Amino acid sequence: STKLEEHLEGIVNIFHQYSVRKGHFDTLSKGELKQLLTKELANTIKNIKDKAVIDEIFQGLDANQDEQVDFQEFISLVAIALKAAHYHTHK
Amino acid sequence: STKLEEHLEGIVNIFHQYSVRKGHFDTLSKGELKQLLTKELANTIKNIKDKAVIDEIFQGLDANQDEQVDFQEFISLVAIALKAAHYHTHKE
Ligand code: NA
Ligand code: NA
Ligand SMILES: [Zn+2]
Numbered sequence: 235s236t237k238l239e240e241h242l243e244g245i246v247n248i249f250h251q252y253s254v255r256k257g258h259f260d261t262l263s264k265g266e267l268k269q270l271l272t273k274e275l276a277n278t279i280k281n282i283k284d285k286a287v288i289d290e291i292f293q294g295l296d297a298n299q300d301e302q303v304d305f306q307e308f309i310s311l312v313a314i315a316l317k318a319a320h321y322h323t324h325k
Numbered sequence: 326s327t328k329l330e331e332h333l334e335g336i337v338n339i340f341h342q343y344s345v346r347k348g349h350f351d352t353l354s355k356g357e358l359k360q361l362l363t364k365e366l367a368n369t370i371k372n373i374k375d376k377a378v379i380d381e382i383f384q385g386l387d388a389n390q391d392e393q394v395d396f397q398e399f400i401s402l403v404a405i406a407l408k409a410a411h412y413h414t415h416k417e
């Protein structure tokens with residue numbers, strides 16, 4: 235298992251330590267996602283100098299509350315944070 | 326600084342360890358990217374049962390082998406790989 239594979243597993247692991255808490259073990263409510271993002275990306279968020287980017291991380295987490303967040307939807311948010319984090323390494 | 330942030334940091338580091346080697350420090354050749362994927366995702370690849378997912382990870386890489394690939398293209402592959410990683414934590 236490479237360092238890259240350990241990071242992928244690590245990201246899955248973080249999703250799961252939230253998703254297992256309530257409801258279906260493999261999804262999150264939008265409320266739980268929002269808590270996850272606010273805490274687990276707190277620095278990434280502080281350092282992002284274009285707030286469109288913040289808004290984009292949080293887009294739609296205050297409506298369609300009946301619809302749950304699966305890992306696929308989480309991957310999309312990870313992709314956004316991975317761009318933000320790259321960019322920050324060049325600041 | 327959070328554990329999640331460290332994984333993002335690490336993935337960026339890995340990319341950089343290949344992108345810096347030649348020419349522009351922030352892009353790599355499709356050929357270099359094939360080397361990265363084949364080595365850094367070695368076990369991920371074996372565990373993938375779906376040949377189509379494997380072809381998707383290597384899509385486009387043998388044609389235009391000297392074409393430059395940037396971090397964003399690398400993000401797309403990370404996403405594919407993350408889906409596979411997830412799928413595989415649930416293997417029985
Ligand atoms: Na859940
Ligand atoms: Na390069
Ligand atoms: Zn899962």
Ligand SMILES: [Zn+2]
Pocket residue numbers: 320323324341351396
């Ligand atoms: Zn870079």
